[PDB]
């Protein structure tokens, strides 16, 4: 099954995105939850899954981290189960992502799902990132204040009670708070952006690991000074320009970024097939009609001519086939065209499959 | 005692520095070695000292690292003892440095001293750095080739036999080779420069340790694209500009560099006094005529208004007193003027002394 977003994108972009929060009434028409509260909890029981439980009694809070052996000593009110990146683990929930590809893939994060009993929620906070909160079964009251991870109470600019299929969009910076009125499922479609710090330090590691930027400062026309202990401004400029020059070299930064943002912020369900596929086995499967499916949560992005998957750079002369890898979550032989006839390309595919990044049926 | 360099600096800079090697005949007139071969070897016996022994027999080489218990099983020919940063450990040798402050302090490294028996030396190599090799007692034949850490044999553009007080200058990149003809002391005054790699990775650590560059990429006018998996050039530009912007912020980079180049490339002889000095004790000493002496090898550099010593930033409103710290290896009360009357400044001095960076007599 799949989901249709009822929403005017150019307007939402013009007037809300990264600017102003809004509640989209029945954004999803006749919304059907892709996962039961039961399924969700059973999933948080597993260790590879980043979950959390938030409770408030007597005015004080209580976070407990997953996984979870028992699901009692728990009240009937005032707690919330929050599970990170469920699109990594449950094929149906990953479909909630697809209608947001009107926003660029590289900026999309994953999907957090929360389950709360009446009164349950996390209290007033703010996020560094864009979010869409989709209301599933039940009902929740959400408050959002103007812009200024706990914060002090705030006057609300939006105060609404979401009904199934409603979507609350919140830009980064706006404080929000939400709690359940009946037993509620919320699906947060989250976004990500790097800060300058993450950029500078990650690019440095690439430079360092790959032995680049190995040219030395040279001063054949070394300037005079009055005090030998001084470092002069022009000298400082020269050092700066070495750094600018390296950042601006056409290939290196592009190539590092690709390897950086193509990585996920949460653990993937990587399960290498045994025995490994032969490039022939891949060819046969495809031509027989089998469907090659991308692993949930696995980011695949194109920067110029290169394509990157979970850190790996992928190069191939078959531009349209390679495009298919990045745009379709489910691939068939037609998507590849005559690229399947190049054994170099089959080989490349087979590697990706053996790494666990795509799998059959 | 102290040393006088007989040499025309503007010409040497115009025509040789970072351009072309040259032998300066009797650069030091009536040269007296500041250290015996005995003293040198005894010093390499100590563990805090970076030494090395290079031998060749039968065509093959043999490096052994310090320190050294016994000084036999050693031939009469074909070996060399090389000791790193002797200016850190032997007050007299540190004076060989002073006449090179016609070149900027920040570019000067330390002083390596080698002792070789006839035939001893390291064979054909090249360095990434400028050097002046001063010939002490004895005689050595040095060869230098044109420019292109072992290398293949080379035709020589300079082939000379140095006599005491001669100085061989070699820019970075030029292959050289030298061996003893009689028992020879060589004093290498070494230089240093950073590469872009060292810059980018060190600045990143500063950004990271000090919690800077924490602004996030924002795209309120996020661009349209045909394939949602693409990252567009303008997006890449925006990311780059975040990095340029941070490097160019007036204070941060200046401040990091200061903390970086003010550090030594070899271990210092840091010996914190016990008990610590009181700011009064410092004041008294100075006014009584005692001489405050900078620890050997300790770099002290000024960048704009700030002054940096072995990593520490030093700020004080007494600009000329602070200047004295960077220009004089030996300080007296006069050097400080009325800054000694500010207890804030005495306090600052006392800290530096207790760290072991300066000491009395
Ligand atoms: Fe939130
Ligand atoms: Fe050398």
Swiss-Prot record, chains A, B:
Keywords: Dioxygenase, Iron, Metal-binding, Oxidoreductase. One of its GO terms (biological process) is post-translational protein modification. It catalyses: L-arginyl-[ribosomal protein uL16] + 2-oxoglutarate + O2 = (3R)-3-hydroxy-L-arginyl-[ribosomal protein uL16] + succinate + CO2. Disruption phenotype: Cells lacking this gene grow similarly as wild-type under standard conditions, but show reduced growth under low nutrient conditions; this result correlates with a bulk protein translation rate that is lower by a factor of three or four in the deletion mutant strain than that in the wild-type. Deletion of this gene also leads to loss of uL16 (Rpl16) hydroxylation. Fe cation binds at residues 125, 127, 176. Pfam families: JmjC_2 (PF08007), ROXA-like_wH (PF20514). Its EC number is 1.14.11.47. Its cofactor is Fe(2+). InterPro entries: JmjC_dom, NO66-like, ROXA-like_wH. Substrate binds at residues 114, 125-127, 140, 176. Binds 1 Fe(2+) ion per subunit. GO terms for molecular function: 2-oxoglutarate-dependent dioxygenase activity; ferrous iron binding; protein homodimerization activity. The keyword Metal-binding applies. Growth-regulating oxygenase that catalyzes the hydroxylation of ribosomal protein uL16 on 'Arg-81'. Homodimer. PANTHER family: MINA53 MYC INDUCED NUCLEAR ANTIGEN, RIBOSOMAL OXYGENASE 1. Belongs to the ROX family. RoxA/YcfD subfamily. This is Ribosomal protein uL16 3-hydroxylase. It comes from Escherichia coli (strain K12).
């Amino acid at each position: 099954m799949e989901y249709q977003l009822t929403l005017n994108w150019p307007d939402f972009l013009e007037r809300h995105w990264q600017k102003r929060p809004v509640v989209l009434k029945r954004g999803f028409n006749n919304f059907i939850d892709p996962i039961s509260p039961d399924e969700l909890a059973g999933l948080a029981m597993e260790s590879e899954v980043d979950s959390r439980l938030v409770s408030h009694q007597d005015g004080k809070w209580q976070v407990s981290h997953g996984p979870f052996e028992s699901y009692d000593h728990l009240g009937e009110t005032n707690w919330s189960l929050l599970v990170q990146a469920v699109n990594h683990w449950h094929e149906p929930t990953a479909a909630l992502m697809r209608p947001f590809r009107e926003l660029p893939d590289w900026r999309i994060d994953d999907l957090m799902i929360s389950f709360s009993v009446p009164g349950g929620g996390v209290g007033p906070h703010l996020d560094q990132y864009d979010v869409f909160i989709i209301q599933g079964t039940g009902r929740r009251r959400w408050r959002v204040g103007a812009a200024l991870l706990q914060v002090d109470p705030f006057e609300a600019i939006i105060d609404e009670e979401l009904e199934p299929g409603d979507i609350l969009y919140i830009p980064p910076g706006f404080p929000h708070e939400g709690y359940a009125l009946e037993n509620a499922m919320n699906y947060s479609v989250g976004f990500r952006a790097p800060n300058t710090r993450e950029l500078i330090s990650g690019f440095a590691d690439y430079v360092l690991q790959r032995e680049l930027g190995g040219n030395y400062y040279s001063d054949p026309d070394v300037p005079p000074r009055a005090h030998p202990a001084d470092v002069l401004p022009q000298e400082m400029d020269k050092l700066r320009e070495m750094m600018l020059e390296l950042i601006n070299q056409p290939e290196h930064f592009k190539q590092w970024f690709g390897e950086f943002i193509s990585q996920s912020r949460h653990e993937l369900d990587i399960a290498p097939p045994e025995p490994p596929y032969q490039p022939d086995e891949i060819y046969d499967a495809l031509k027989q009609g089998e469907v090659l499916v991308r692993l949930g949560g696995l980011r695949v992005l194109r920067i110029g001519d290169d394509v990157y998957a979970n850190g790996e750079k992928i190069d191939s002369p078959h531009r349209p086939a390679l495009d298919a890898l990045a745009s379709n979550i489910a691939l068939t032989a037609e998507n590849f065209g005559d690229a399947l006839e190049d054994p170099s390309f089959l080989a490349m595919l087979a590697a990706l499959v053996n790494s666990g990044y795509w799998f059959f049926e």
